[PDB]
């Protein structure tokens, strides 16, 4: 499996052109994955204060933007643990 770099002289009175040849399709895919454009992440919002989210409590995975919001989320998680068990 090789990559062939080729430069030729071809009439246009002459112009220079360069070509790159891949022996196998695996190398071509590896060098050119043709990746689709990435997606813009959704701007998460704090369920407690509705302000734009700035943090992410690891235990509950609930984004929040206020210390009071964190306390409320942790109280809700404690109540959920007490109820469900």
């Amino acid at each position: 499996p090789i990559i062939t770099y080729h430069s030729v002289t071809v009439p246009l009175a002459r112009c220079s052109r360069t070509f790159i040849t891949f022996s196998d399709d695996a190398t071509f895919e590896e060098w050119f994955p043709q990746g689709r454009p990435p997606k813009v992440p959704v701007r998460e919002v704090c369920p407690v204060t509705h302000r734009p989210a700035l943090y992410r409590d690891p235990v509950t995975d609930i984004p929040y933007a206020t210390a009071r919001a964190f306390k409320i989320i942790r109280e809700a998680y404690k109540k959920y643990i007490t109820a469900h068990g």
Binding site: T4, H6, S7, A13, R14, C15, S16, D24
Partner: protein, 438 residues
């Protein structure tokens, strides 16, 4: 557009202006008059060109403004760039990094050139097609093929790994006129024979093309490398010597290194590998050297690697620096016995006018005959340099009033505006108490 080199004090001096018999012409190559001194300078120049006698010293002595430095610059211009010419001032040998003897040694050895001439095989051609095959992943042996073309030849070369790496580093493409040295493998691109493909973007404006080389592909060319003894000493003193060639900071080079280098250069000369190109060291205002420097010069001129030494001084019987001894030219008699002295006579009226005419021609200034007469009278009364400066000053004054030719009125105006030493001293005497000390 103005180059880095502009009209200076000696910009009009293109040579000594001598004929085949070393007879000075009255006005040629910028030099006017000083016939005896120019003839002596020509004899010294022939001695330098012959390059057979080491450690010859010449002293150009005369009154201020008599053309000592003009003669030195004429000798330098007549020698040409092939022969080394180190021009330094006497004050330059006083250095905080090295001793005075070390500075003098470096000045001497900057005036001797070592030339190495060798023949190498050279490939120069237009790249037609280059192909490089490399493994997709991991270490492997690159295989390649290169086609080169001249007006009368075209050969396809099988490329090795290191030549492949060199071509890849140089980014050699089709249409590039490249030079390959077979021994070292160095590749130098010297142009493009035609443009690249137009459909490519972000390529920039294409420059002019270069005609394809003619003749055979693999030629044999003579390569000449010329360095001075000082450069060899510096690059051999220490590993960082190549950087010391530019930053200075050479310190004091061991005498062992210089002795070894002298021996090796002698061996090369005997074996025909290298030729020694003796030059000139010109110390302007040599009276600033002290007694120790003169004593070092005394015995340093006795070496076979010493160049021709040319000194200029305008001193009479003056105290030698570092001593309390009065000597001619400020130079000890022991050194004065080792050197030939070239005297410069003062200039007459016609010589002064001719020098002024040459200066005006150099500065592209048009002046009237009456203005030339007045300027010559001022130069005879005051000095030559004052008249030379008034040339440009009057040119500027004339250009200010939308004129074309420098008249007597402009010369009078610049004479009023700018003062010489004599009138300044008179005006300082008139207000002596106002000035600070004495």
């Amino acid at each position: 557009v103005t180059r880095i080199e502009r009209i200076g004090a000696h910009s009009h001096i293109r040579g000594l202006g001598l004929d085949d018999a070393l007879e000075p012409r009255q006005a040629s190559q910028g030099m006017v008059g000083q016939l005896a001194a120019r003839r002596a300078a020509g004899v010294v120049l022939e001695m330098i060109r012959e390059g057979k006698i080491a450690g010859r010293a010449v002293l150009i002595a005369g009154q201020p403004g008599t053309g000592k430095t003009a003669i030195a610059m004429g000798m330098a211009q007549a020698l040409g760039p092939d022969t080394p010419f180190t021009a330094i001032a006497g004050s330059e040998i006083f250095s905080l990094e090295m001793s005075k003897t070390e500075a003098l040694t470096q000045a001497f050895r900057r005036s001797i050139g070592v030339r190495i001439k060798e023949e190498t095989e050279i490939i120069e051609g237009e790249v037609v097609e280059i192909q490089i095959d490399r493994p997709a992943t991991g270490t492997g042996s690159k295989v390649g093929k290169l086609t080169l073309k001249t007006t009368e030849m075209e050969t396809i070369y099988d490329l090795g790994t290191k030549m492949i790496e060199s071509l890849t580093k140089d980014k050699v493409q089709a249409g590039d006129v490249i030079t390959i040295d077979k021994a070292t493998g160095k590749i130098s691109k010297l142009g493009r024979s035609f443009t690249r493909a137009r459909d490519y973007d972000a390529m920039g404006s294409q420059t002019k093309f270069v005609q394809c080389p003619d003749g055979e592909l693999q030629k044999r060319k003579e390569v000449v490398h010329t360095v001075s003894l000082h450069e060899i000493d510096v690059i051999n003193s220490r590993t960082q010597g190549f950087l010391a060639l530019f930053s200075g900071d050479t310190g004091e080079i061991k005498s062992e290194v210089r002795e070894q280098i002298n021996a090796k250069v002698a061996e090369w000369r005997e074996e025909g590998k290298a030729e020694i190109i003796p030059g000139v060291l010109f110390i302007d205002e040599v009276h600033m050297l002290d007694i120790e420097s003169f004593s070092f010069l005394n015995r340093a001129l006795e070496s076979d690697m010493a160049p021709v030494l040319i000194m200029a001084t305008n001193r009479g019987i003056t105290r030698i620096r570092g001593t309390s001894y009065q000597s001619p030219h400020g130079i000890p008699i022991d050194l004065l016995d080792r050197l030939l002295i070239v005297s410069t006579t003062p200039y007459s009226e016609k010589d002064t006018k001719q020098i002024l005419r040459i200066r005006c021609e150099e500065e592209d200034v048009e002046m009237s005959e009456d203005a030339y007469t007045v300027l010559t009278r001022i130069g005879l009364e005051t000095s030559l340099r004052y008249a030379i400066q008034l040339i440009t000053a009057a040119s500027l004054v004339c250009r200010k009033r939308k004129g074309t030719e420098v008249q007597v009125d402009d010369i009078k105006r610049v004479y009023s505006l700018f003062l010489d030493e004599s009138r300044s001293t008179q005006y300082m005497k008139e207000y002596q108490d106002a000035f600070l000390f004495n």
